[PDB]
């Protein structure tokens, strides 16, 4: 599923990401845009054999189990396939754990490079939440 900008903003708000750990809603929408281009089915391989999954490109090295990343962890205690659903529940729940792991939203490299410090509110502007 390829979410629309406002469609995702509304869903993320309902899933409690607005101001989560001090990060306004726009940060999360912006992160999804540059990580997955709003595609819930996005999968991208990393050089270490791990893979990034879903709307927020959560990796199998530490967060989910995809059964093909030896010596990795599954801190979110979920199959990586759960992060590829049209329903963002699993991705949001895992993202909430990630953002509290010590580096805030810096865990998302695309957010760090394209969103951090910018007018992220523009990503939810004009949207019905």
């Amino acid at each position, epitope marked *: 599923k390829v979410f629309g900008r406002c469609e995702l903003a509304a869903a993320m708000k309902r899933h409690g990401l607005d101001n989560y750990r001090g990060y306004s809603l726009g940060n999360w929408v912006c992160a999804a845009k540059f990580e997955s281009n709003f595609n819930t089915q996005a999968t991208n*391989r*990393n*050089t*270490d054999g791990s893979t*990034d999954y879903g709307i927020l*490109q959560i990796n199998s090295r530490w967060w989910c189990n995809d059964g093909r990343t030896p010596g990795s962890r599954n801190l979110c205690n979920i199959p990586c396939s759960a992060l590829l659903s049209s329903d963002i529940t699993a991705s949001v729940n895992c993202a909430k754990k990630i953002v509290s792991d010590g580096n805030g939203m810096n865990a998302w*490299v*695309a957010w760090r*490079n394209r969103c951090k410090g910018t007018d992220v509110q523009a990503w939810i502007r004009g949207c019905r939440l």
Partner: nanobody
Amino acid sequence: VQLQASGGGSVQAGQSLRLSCATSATSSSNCMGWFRQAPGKEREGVAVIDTGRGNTAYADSVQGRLTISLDNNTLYLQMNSLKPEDTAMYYCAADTSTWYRGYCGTNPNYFSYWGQGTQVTVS
């Protein structure tokens, strides 16, 4: 001449091209790669390499045809069996070592550095 891409050209499908870029790579970056862009379109990740380990990753669209390598200080992109869909501007990119990265990915948004691009046209 830093991160300046070259090697592009206009060729028939099936032929090959070898893109290159100068670096200065294992000290200032964790990851280096190549991304491409068509007029009015978004950047598309093509290949990436871990500057320290040498491990690589590719986009599904170029898997088995393109090869990224680092001759620590030149970055190469061997393009074999070119397809019409490969037509676009190619750029070489790098990230910053000021941030830890235990692995690398092709997402263009994972790289804050890049230089001049080179055109690849395949008919």
